Amino acid sequence: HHWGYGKHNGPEHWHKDFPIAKGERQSPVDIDTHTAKYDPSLKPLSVSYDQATSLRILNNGHAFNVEFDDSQDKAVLKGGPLDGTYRLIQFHFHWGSLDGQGSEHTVDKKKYAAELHLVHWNTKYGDFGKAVQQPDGLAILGIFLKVGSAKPGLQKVVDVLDSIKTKGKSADFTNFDPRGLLPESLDYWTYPGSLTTPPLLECVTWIVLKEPISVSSEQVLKFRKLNFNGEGEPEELMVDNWRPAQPLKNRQIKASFK
Ligand SMILES: [Zn+2]
C-alpha cells in the first residue's frame, strides 16, 4: 500500500507515512501575485546548461525522470536567491488528465496543464542524498506548461515515452539539451519549500518562472499514455500525478520582477 495519487493512497493520505506532510514549509503553494513582494536584493538567475550531459530516462511509477551526469559541474543553476552552485540531477513533469489541471504550483489559483521541475542539488553537500537533509540542499526550477503551440525542444522526450510505458522501464537518453525547455524570460517567484513527493523533505529553494512554455495537445496527450503500473499489471494511466497547493504558513513569496 505505497503512496501514490489514487483515492486510497493519494496526497491526503501521505501524512500517515510522512508526518512532515503537515509541516511548516511544504510545497507546492498557490502564488498570490498581488501579495508577492518584489525583492531588489535578488540577483539575476544564472542557468548554465551548455555542457549538460543527459544519460537516461526512467519511468519510476510516479513520473518520468530525465537523468543527468551530476558528477561534475556541467549543468548548473546559480544566482537569484541562491548562494553557491547547484547541479542538475534530473527533470520531470507533473500533469493532468485534462488540460485544466496538472500543475502543482498555482498562480492566483489558476492551474496549468502541467509543470516541469528541473531538480538541482547544492554542491557544498557532496551528493544528492546528503543535500536533501539540508534546508538549503536543493534548488528546483519550476516551469508551467500550457496547451497551445508545440514545444520543439520537448519532442525528443515525447517520442521516447513509448519505450518506458511502465514502472521500472528505462531507456538511453543522451545528448538531450534542456535549454530547449526554457521560456524566453527568467522572471521568477521564489520561496522556501519542500519536495512535492514523499519523503516531502523541507530542503528546497523553489524558483518558479512567471512565463509558461506552450506545448501541443498532441504532446501532452502522449504524457497521458504512460502507466503508473508495471508491465503485466492492470493498466492505470499516469495522469494527475500532482500534489495540490499546501498552506503558505509563515512564508513570503518574493518576486524578481515588478
Ligand atoms: Zn516534481
State the cell numbers at 189: 517567484
How many angstroms separate the alpha carbon of residue 93 from the centre of ligand 1?
Answer: 6
Q: Which long-range contacts (CB under 8 A, 24 or more apart) does 131-134 make?
A: 131/203, 132/195, 132/199, 132/201, 132/203, 133/201, 133/203, 134/203
How many angstroms separate the alpha carbon of residue 180 from the centre of ligand 1?
Answer: 19
How many angstroms separate the alpha carbon of residue 84 from the centre of ligand 1?
Answer: 22
The annotation status of 92 as a binding-site residue, yes or no, is: yes
Q: Are strands 37-38 and 54-59 parallel, antiparallel or unpaired?
A: unpaired
Phi, psi (5° rounding) for residue 162? Answer: -60, -30
Bridge partner residues of 122 (DSSP) = 86
The annotation status of 174 as a binding-site residue, yes or no, is: no
Nearest residue to 90 via CA among 189, 157, 21? 157
Phi, psi (5° rounding) for residue 191? Answer: -160, 160
The annotation status of 205 as a binding-site residue, yes or no, is: no
Phi, psi (5° rounding) for residue 241? Answer: -95, 45
Q: Which domains does the chain have, with CATH numbers?
A: 1-258 (3.10.200.10)
Is the bond preceding residue 199 a cis peptide, omega within 30 degrees? yes
Resolution in A: 1.5
State the cell numbers at 79: 544566482
The annotation status of 1 as a binding-site residue, yes or no, is: no
The experimental method, as deposited, was: X-ray
The catalytic residues are 62
Cβ distance 168 to 188 under 8 Å?
no
Q: Are strands 188-193 and 254-255 parallel, antiparallel or unpaired?
A: antiparallel
Placement of cell 546528503 in the chain: 130
Grouping H, G, I as helix, E, B as strand and the rest as coil, residue 162 is helix
How many angstroms separate the alpha carbon of residue 94 from the centre of ligand 1?
Answer: 6
Q: HSE (CB half, 13 Å, CA atoms) of 255?
A: 13
